[PDB]
Design a protein around this ligand. Structure first.
Ligand code: ZN
Ligand code: ZN
Ligand code: ZN
Ligand code: ZN
Ligand code: ZN
Lengths: 196, 445, 356, 293, 387
């Protein structure tokens, strides 16, 4: 279709590959591209090698695009046997487990973008099925999900992302985090006094 | 035109009368201000020194770039005879009028003034409560009479006589009513300062035989006085004149002490908006004004339908437009009133419209039209409708024995500009009634 | 409460202005103004477009920069088609830079930006600069990506070795290289990378850069600069100028070689000696002896006078005292004068009025 | 054309004026200037009816605004004068009487530094208020200073006065200077007039002062570009050294503090900001011109 | 004028114009960064494309194979337009563009010969990029952490796609091709022209950066400019006299002069006005009275004379005696310049009969004074040094 050609203009495209060595080289190139400032976009698999330990803190991860719920292959004998065993033994519904299995992987990738409280990024989940999965997400992610973002469009979502990126760029007021999100030794002692 | 109009009236006065007019320092102080800044600078420079400076020295002061302003300042200054040019010893010497010099010196140095500015009784009155309403109501009553709207109280015969005797507000007994003229609309279109000068200027000219200098000695002295204070009662002519001025809302009298009003100070020198209005394509007017004066003038050419406290809304109709045009109001004046009383939204949109027009085609700078062109075209087209038929009064000449005679008589009428139409083949032509007598007399000779 | 709301906001605004100390500043400056003209600058976020507004603000910045820094020099660079384009040599003539920017206003921007190319050109242009000058680089970046032929990291290290300082003004979001460039080049300081939040905010950022930047304690270089004060002379006949070789009515005469010049301040074309007037140095004096900020007087105490000392404006009666006093001289002032005395003037009238 | 504000600064101090009379033969010459000033101010009010007048007096112990009088009466002029002229003249003289009375009471106080700089700075603020308040008004500064009294040190007057020059140039406010005393030229005051399209005048004799003011100090801001100023003095835009007190054409200024230095300071260190110069770098300046061997 | 006729050395002329030389060199000495070149090309029956010299060079840099087939066939077999017409129609262009090659496509016979060579090039390129990776992002060790992992094979959705015959569909190859292309671009940037610990640490938890700016306090004290005392009792007498004079009466009418000093004041004021007015009238180059031909010659002499003065002062103030010979040569040139200036005046004097001689001298008076002053300074310093 030629969609990649447009992407090539703005960022370099790095693709995960089954070979471990080649994928490692892609990460090095992806990190190198992000460092200098050339820009790079990495396409990976939610259940792949990148998502099981590789971190994208700060500049490496600024926007995460979860393309669909990472559902397993339903028509698999191994999964079907496991699903039946849980339902009979632990009384867990097959649909409930399937949703939990997919969310646990979608959330996994979302948490590989923030390291400290000075990091920022946008987590977009592109599927109509995520709208009802807010309760299944991690608490620290759910709390940050506004009620108005449950169902968004491409045009509307882009504008919100642009506003968020611009706002976070502004210098943070130190007083806004002196003793509410970051504690010094004196602040810690005060908390130990009020609590006791 | 304010300074020129007042200056022009004084220029036409004979030099003999002008010298007597400068005796009072108060009059000169006002006359000094009206002059151009360059003229004032030179006059004040030479007033304190009893010497004569050649014109060449004065020229040296002016820079080459400002050379043009020097011609206007000297011409205007010399026209009033304030500066007396004396030529002697082969040089065009320059000197100041002795009466003007002494009078100017006295005011600035605190010399004897002979109570030119009046006296103070230390018995003040409330200005806004009494002075403002009295002159405003008196000035509003005449304005309501001027605009033609019915009013319970009508002005006295004095100003009424002045109004009719001027081009202002032509009147006819057979009609039994008074209506504004072309100059009247301009007068109503002038600022308060000029609206006062026009009546005052007419008063100066209309009066016959009371001395002309005494009337100017009071008007200029009137500006010197300050609103909200008493002045004990002065020339004999200034007594009846003071009462006459009382009818124009310039000076307020309790019944022994007279008080100048806000209009008195306006004479000496100058000093969302009320009157701003919105006009739409559908010929509707929405005036964001709360004042009887604005509504009355709008009603002249607007079929106003309703009004609110903050704004007045109406509709422009053929009947209303025809009524106004019948009174002598020109379309150019109407648009000028609309343009100068345009709402900021129209101005802002016009600027945006100009920006869009310039942005698309910046090569040509299109004119800035605050209101839609269709209104301009329709109003102008309606004006053409009234001017659709043209008729002249006169006589038709025919039955010419020889072609030379026809050309001779026809050519003569053309020379004196009394020929309206001619036809060579028919040997016929028509001349205006004004030139009928001249053509007939020429024919006999 | 509405009136109090404005008052408390003024106090919060005054909070930052409280901390003022005479930091050492480099009056002599050499600025390399870099503007980004790429495909990313064709967006309509700034009306009419980013390129038009940036150029317009650039002209204003040039006027302001030379007004308050008469003894400084500036250069203009532009990024176009992935290449760095030079549009004005480093010079002390404000008119030359303004004329160049006006011509640039016509050409449409296109291509991609190249920071490494722009920085490399700036490094070369700043090589022939005296050690006593402060080398500064103002970069206007609008693109979120950079295409460069070489390694940007090496250039950044070279910039640090050359004691160059870089200020970057973004348009859309933060760029990793810009933060690193503004951090490593400014001794780790993170306040030199600024992103505008709206159209109005951009004006303040450009105006802020006018003031000389403070110098680092470790980067301390002290030296004596040789300069001259020419005497203006009026001639009855035009004479050739030593700078442009054109007929002019008159010019300032250099005291070192008597060669005449057209306009000041400029380096003498003959003896290469910087020629200035006493006024030129006087302007930068306020940066050396900044006027201490006035502290608002609490309403609890009793005020001295009902009218301002310097403007004789009656203090409104109205909750919060509308008076500000100067600690040095203890003279109350109205709100209007304090802004005027700290932005237009730079001397407290009360302190001067006090005899000793 | 448009109204203009005239802000006259009067540097009347007991010490300054007293020395002027002894050297001259005009006893009480301050009255002559004061009475002449009254006429000059009246002339300004007579130019137009929309122009205001401001008077600021610089006395020994500080500055005072003679007009307009603070919100916080003797007969010196006949009450038959024009109200506006009288309203300003009477108030001005009334403030003058109070000012002298206060100064006479505090005569014993020891004053060493002139307050001319402070008065100008206050005047600039007042001009901004009047212009800012009313809106499309011009402004002008006129300093009537008696330079006969020898000043202590103008060095500290450079920074304030020079700062006022730039502010005046920013808001297009010409500054006029009139000097009455022995010294023909005031280097710092002259720069104020030249740098802001102003006029500098010096008159040795107080008699006939109105003629100078009316003809030379009456150029309103409206017609400045079309009128050639009568200023005759020529300035050099030079500054005095920091440790020798002599005009320098070519010299050295410390980069850190921009302190002019005619010669290399002793000890190879700045004598003002205590900045140590590199021995190698300074040696370059000390190097003599190259001559063939 | 300064090098051909005057004879100034070329090296000296360029000494003061180093920035000019550098500015021009950098214009043509900079190159754009790497980018995906083949993706930009769009074929847009009849299909037309618009190539450019810049595009041609960029293609070679990113794809050495294209250059290899270009250098060996351009002059030999067919012209460049035919070569690129075949290249785009060939399957090689599709393969290099990271697009799945279609067996149905005919391609070009000549270009197809290099398809096998590209496979060798890719293998060579793979080694050019292969290198040890940091353990932090070493995905190889993650799968080799437990080399005896035995488990159910992943479903076909977690494995590369295959066709009915079981072989790869080839779409994975383009992913590697695109992946290799990105790696090459980054590596090309890093041309000839501890860390892990720092990355893992949380910067936000560290102490906030503290500014280390310097502070200067400047003392204000200097001597006054260098080229009857009244006591308090005397002062107190004046205040009493003025107070008595003010309180008693103040006459504004005395301000008027006696008419004997007014004329003197006016004459003095006018005298300054005449001087000021004369300057004002003559306060794009101003109009000149000299003929056009003479004007250019005067400017040429002024310009060349100024250039010598600039060079003379540079060497005179250089501070190193090694340039003594150059100063002597320049001093002789300056002496010749004075003679040339005198010769021009004599030539103008006789040719124009003194009419333009006065005007000519005035135009070059300031430079003549500067030139003679420079020689006088050189002579005065030279004489003192000699003895
Ligand atoms: Zn020139
Ligand atoms: Zn020189
Ligand atoms: Zn104030
Ligand atoms: Zn203070
Ligand atoms: Zn220093």
């Amino acid at each position: 279709m030629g969609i990649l050609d447009e992407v090539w203009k703005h960022k370099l495209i790095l693709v995960e590959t089954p070979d471990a060595q080649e994928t490692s080289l892609a990460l090095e190139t992806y990190r190198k591209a992000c460092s200098n400032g050339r820009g790079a976009i990495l396409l990976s698999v939610a259940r792949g090698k990148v998502s099981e330990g590789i971190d994208f803190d700060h500049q490496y991860g600024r926007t995460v695009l979860m393309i669909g719920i990472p559902f397993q292959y339903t028509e698999s004998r191994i999964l079907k046997a496991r699903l039946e065993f849980m339902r009979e033994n632990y009384r867990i519904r097959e649909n409930d487990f399937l949703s939990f299995d997919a969310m646990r992987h979608a959330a996994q990738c979302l948490g590989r973008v923030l390291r400290g409280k000075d990091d920022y990024g946008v987590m977009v989940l592109a599927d109509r099925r995520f709208s009802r999965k807010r309760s299944q997400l991690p608490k620290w992610i759910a709390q940050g999900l506004s009620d108005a973002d449950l169902n968004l469009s491409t045009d509307m979502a882009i504008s919100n992302t642009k506003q968020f990126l611009r706002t976070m760029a502004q210098p943070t007021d130190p007083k806004d985090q002196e003793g509410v999100s970051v504690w010094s030794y004196e602040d810690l002692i005060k908390h130990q006094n009020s609590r006791k | 035109s304010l300074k020129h109009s007042v200056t022009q009236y004084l220029e036409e006065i004979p030099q003999q009368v002008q010298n007597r007019l400068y005796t009072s320092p108060a009059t000169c102080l006002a006359i000094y201000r009206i002059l151009p800044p360059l003229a004032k600078f030179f006059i004040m420079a030479m007033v304190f020194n009893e010497n004569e400076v050649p014109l060449l020295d004065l020229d040296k002061w002016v820079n080459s770039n400002g050379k043009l302003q020097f011609q206007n300042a000297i011409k205007s200054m010399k026209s009033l005879h304030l500066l007396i040019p004396n030529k002697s010893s082969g040089t065009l010497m320059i000197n100041l009028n002795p009466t003007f010099k002494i009078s100017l010196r006295n005011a600035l140095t605190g010399g004897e003034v002979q109570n030119s500015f009046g006296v103070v009784v230390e018995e003040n009155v409330v200005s806004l409560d009494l002075l403002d309403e009295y002159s405003a109501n008196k000035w509003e009553t005449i304005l309501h009479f001027m605009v033609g709207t019915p009013l319970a109280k009508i002005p006295s015969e004095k100003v009424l006589n002045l109004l009719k005797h001027s081009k202002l507000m032509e009147e006819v007994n057979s009609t039994g009513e008074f209506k504004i003229t072309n100059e009247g609309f301009q007068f109503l279109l002038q600022e308060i300062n000029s609206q006062l000068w026009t009546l005052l200027l007419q008063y100066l000219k209309m009066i016959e035989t009371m001395d002309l200098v005494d009337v100017l000695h009071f008007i200029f002295m009137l500006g010197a006085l300050e609103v909200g204070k008493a002045y004990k009662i002065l020339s004999e002519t200034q007594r009846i004149m003071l009462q006459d001025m009382r009818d124009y809302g310039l000076v307020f009298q309790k019944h022994s002490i007279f008080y100048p009003t806000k209009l008195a100070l306006m004479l000496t020198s100058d000093t969302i908006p009320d009157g701003s209005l919105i006009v739409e394509t559908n010929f509707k007017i929405y005036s964001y004004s709360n004042s009887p004066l604005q509504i009355a003038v709008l009603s002249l050419f607007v079929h106003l339908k309703a009004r609110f406290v903050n704004m007045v809304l109406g509709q422009i109709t053929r009947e209303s437009i025809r009524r106004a045009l019948t009174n002598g109001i020109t379309a150019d004046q109407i648009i000028a009133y609309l343009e100068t009383h345009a709402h900021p939204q129209m101005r802002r949109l016009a600027e945006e419209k100009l920006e869009k027009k310039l942005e698309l085609d910046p090569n040509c700078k299109e004119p800035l039209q605050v209101l839609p062109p269709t209104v301009v075209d329709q109003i102008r087209l309606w004006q053409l409708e009234l001017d659709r038929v043209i008729t002249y009064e006169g006589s038709l000449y025919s039955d010419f024995e020889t072609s030379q005679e026809y050309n001779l008589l026809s050519k003569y009428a053309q020379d004196i500009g009394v020929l309206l139409w001619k036809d060579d083949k028919k040997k016929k032509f028509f001349i205006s009634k004004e030139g009928n007598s001249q053509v007939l007399d020429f024919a006999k000779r | 409460a509405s009136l109090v709301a404005s008052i408390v906001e003024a106090r919060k605004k005054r909070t930052a202005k409280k901390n003022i100390t005479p930091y050492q500043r480099g009056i002599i400056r050499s600025l390399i103004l870099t503007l980004d003209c790429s495909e990313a600058m064709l967006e309509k976020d700034l009306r009419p477009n980013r390129h038009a507004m940036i150029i317009q603000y650039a002209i204003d910045f040039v006027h302001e920069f030379f007004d308050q820094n008469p003894i400084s020099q500036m250069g203009i660079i532009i990024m176009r088609n992935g290449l760095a384009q030079l549009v004005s040599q480093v010079s002390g003539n404000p008119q030359d830079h303004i004329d160049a920017l006006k011509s640039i206003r016509k050409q449409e921007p296109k291509g991609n930006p190249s920071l490494q190319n722009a920085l490399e050109m700036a490094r070369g242009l700043l090589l022939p600069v005296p050690a006593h000058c402060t080398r500064e680089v103002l970069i206007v970046f609008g693109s979120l990506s950079t295409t460069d032929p070489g390694d940007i990291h090496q250039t950044i290290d070279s910039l640090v070795s050359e004691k160059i300082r870089v200020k970057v003004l973004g348009l859309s979001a933060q760029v990793a290289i810009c933060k690193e460039l503004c951090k490593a080049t400014n001794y780790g300081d993170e306040s030199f990378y600024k992103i505008l939040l709206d159209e109005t905010h951009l004006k303040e950022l450009f105006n802020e850069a006018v003031t000389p930047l403070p110098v680092n304690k470790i980067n301390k270089g002290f030296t004596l600069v040789k300069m001259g004060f020419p005497t203006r002379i009026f001639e009855d006949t035009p004479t050739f100028c030593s700078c442009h070789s054109k007929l002019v009515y008159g010019g300032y005469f250099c005291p070192n070689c008597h060669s005449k010049v057209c306009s000041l301040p400029t380096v003498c074309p003959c003896c290469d000696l910087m020629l200035i007037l006493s006024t030129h140095l006087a302007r930068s004096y306020h940066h050396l002896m900044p006027l201490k900020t006035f502290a608002e007087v609490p309403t609890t105490e009793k005020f001295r006078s009902e009218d301002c000392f310097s403007c004789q404006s009656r203090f409104p009666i109205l909750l919060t005292s509308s008076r500000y006093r100067c600690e040095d001289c203890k003279q109350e002032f109205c709100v209007d004068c304090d802004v005027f005395i700290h932005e237009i003037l730079h001397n407290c009238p009360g302190c001067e009025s006090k005899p000793v | 054309e448009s109204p203009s504000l005239l802000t006259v600064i009067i540097e009347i101090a007991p010490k300054l004026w007293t020395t002027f009379d002894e050297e001259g033969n005009e006893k009480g010459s301050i009255i002559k200037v004061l009475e002449a000033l009254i006429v000059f101010l009246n002339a300004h009010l007579a130019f137009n009816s929309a122009n205001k007048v401001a008077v600021i007096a610089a006395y020994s112990q500080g500055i005072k605004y003679l007009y307009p009088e603070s919100t916080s009466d003797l007969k010196i002029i006949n009450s038959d004068m024009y109200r506006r002229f009288r309203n300003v003249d009477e108030t001005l003289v009334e403030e003058i009487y109070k000012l002298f009375e206060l100064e006479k009471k505090q005569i014993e106080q020891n004053s060493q530094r002139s307050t001319l700089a402070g008065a100008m700075s206050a005047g600039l603020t007042y001009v901004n208020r009047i212009s800012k308040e009313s809106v499309s008004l011009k402004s002008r500064l006129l300093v009537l200073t008696c330079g006969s009294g020898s000043s202590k040190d103008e060095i500290f007057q450079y920074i304030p006065i020079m700062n006022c020059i730039f502010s005046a140039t920013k808001m297009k406010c010409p500054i006029d200077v009139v000097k009455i005393g022995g010294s023909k030229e005031s280097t710092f005051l002259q720069q104020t007039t030249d740098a802001t399209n102003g006029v500098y005048l010096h008159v040795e004799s107080t008699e006939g002062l109105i003629q100078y003011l009316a003809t030379a100090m009456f150029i309103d801001p409206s017609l400045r570009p079309i009128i050639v100023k009568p200023n005759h003095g020529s300035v050099d835009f030079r500054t005095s050294c920091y440790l020798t007190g002599r005009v320098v054409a070519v010299g050295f200024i410390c980069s850190v503090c921009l302190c002019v230095l005619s010669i290399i300071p002793p000890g190879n260190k700045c004598p003002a900001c205590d900045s140590q110069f590199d021995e190698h770098v300074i040696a370059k300046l000390k190097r003599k011109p190259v001559v063939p061997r | 004028e300064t090098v051909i006729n005057a004879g100034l050395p070329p090296s000296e002329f360029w000494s003061t114009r180093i920035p000019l030389l550098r500015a021009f060199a950098l214009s043509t000495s900079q190159k754009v960064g790497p980018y995906n070149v083949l993706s930009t090309i769009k074929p847009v029956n009849k299909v037309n494309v618009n190539l450019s010299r810049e595009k041609i060079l960029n293609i070679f840099e990113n794809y050495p194979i294209v250059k290899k087939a270009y250098t060996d066939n351009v002059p030999k077999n067919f012209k460049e337009p035919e070569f690129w017409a075949r290249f785009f129609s060939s399957k090689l262009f599709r393969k290099l563009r990271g697009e799945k090659i279609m067996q149905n496509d005919r391609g070009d016979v000549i270009i197809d010969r290099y398809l096998t060579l590209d496979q060798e090039f890719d293998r060579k390129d793979d080694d050019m990029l292969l290198h040890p990776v940091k353990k932090i992002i070493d995905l190889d060790g993650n799968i080799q952490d437990d080399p005896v992992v035995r488990g159910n094979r992943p479903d076909f959705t977690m494995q590369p796609g295959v066709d009915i015959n079981g072989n790869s569909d080839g779409t994975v190859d383009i992913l590697k091709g695109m992946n290799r292309l990105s790696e090459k671009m980054i590596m090309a940037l890093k041309n000839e022209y501890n860390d892990e610990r720092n990355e893992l640490k949380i910067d936000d938890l560290n102490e906030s950066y503290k500014t280390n700016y310097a502070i200067i306090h400047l003392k204000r004290n200097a001597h006054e400019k260098t080229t009857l005392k009244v006591s308090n009792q005397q002062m107190l007498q004046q205040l009493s006299l003025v107070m008595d004079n003010l309180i008693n009466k103040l006459d504004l009418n005395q301000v008027v002069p006696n008419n004997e000093v007014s004329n003197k004041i006016n004459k003095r004021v006018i005298t300054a006005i005449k001087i000021n007015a004369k300057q004002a009238k003559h306060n794009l180059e101003v109009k000149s009275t000299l003929p056009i031909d003479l004007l250019e010659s005067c400017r040429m002499l002024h310009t060349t004379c100024c250039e010598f003065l600039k060079h003379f002062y540079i060497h005179f103030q250089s501070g190193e005696q090694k340039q003594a010979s150059t100063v002597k040569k320049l001093y002789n040139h300056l002496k010749d310049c004075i003679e040339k200036l005198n010769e021009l005046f004599q030539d103008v004097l006789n040719g124009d009969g003194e009419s333009m001689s006065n005007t000519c001298t005035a135009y070059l008076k300031p430079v003549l004074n500067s030139i003679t002053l420079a020689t006088h300074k050189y002579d005065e310093y030279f004489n003192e040094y000699n003895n």
